[PDB]
Amino acid sequence: KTHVQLSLPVLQVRDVLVRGFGDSVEEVLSEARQHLKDGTCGLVEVEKGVLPQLEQPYVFIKRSDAAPHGHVMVELVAELEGIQYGRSGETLGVLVPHVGEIPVAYRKVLLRK
């Protein structure tokens, strides 16, 4: 399928133990997609002070369109030293590995895969 319904655990930035997916734009997009498939991906909502507490390159979920079955359609965009790889809509948050952190909420998305 081109899209997959997911419910992503929303994590507090200060709880996150593994603060990014790797060391290159291509690696972080690869690992993000792998963790999304394996159900081991979390979401951090972006506010002032969040991104400096995480590791670049960043992987964002961005709104790809205006929301089936209560799931916002999203796609992945990576960022490194202020350059984005991908072009999309509003940021829903930054993706991180999930390794058992307790979430504050869930974000229902339809992920373009």
Curated annotation (Swiss-Prot):
Places the protein is found: Host cytoplasm
Chain ranges of the CoV Nsp1 globular domain: 2-113
Spans annotated as Disordered: 1-113
Gene that specifies this protein: rep
Protein name as catalogued: Host translation inhibitor nsp1
Function: Inhibits host translation by associating with the open head conformation of the 40S subunit. The C-terminus binds to and obstructs ribosomal mRNA entry tunnel. Thereby inhibits antiviral response triggered by innate immunity or interferons. The nsp1-40S ribosome complex further induces an endonucleolytic cleavage near the 5'UTR of host mRNAs, targeting them for degradation. This inhibits the integrated stress response (ISR) in the infected cell by preventing EIF2S1/eIF2-alpha phosphorylation upstream of stress granule formation and depletes host G3BP1.
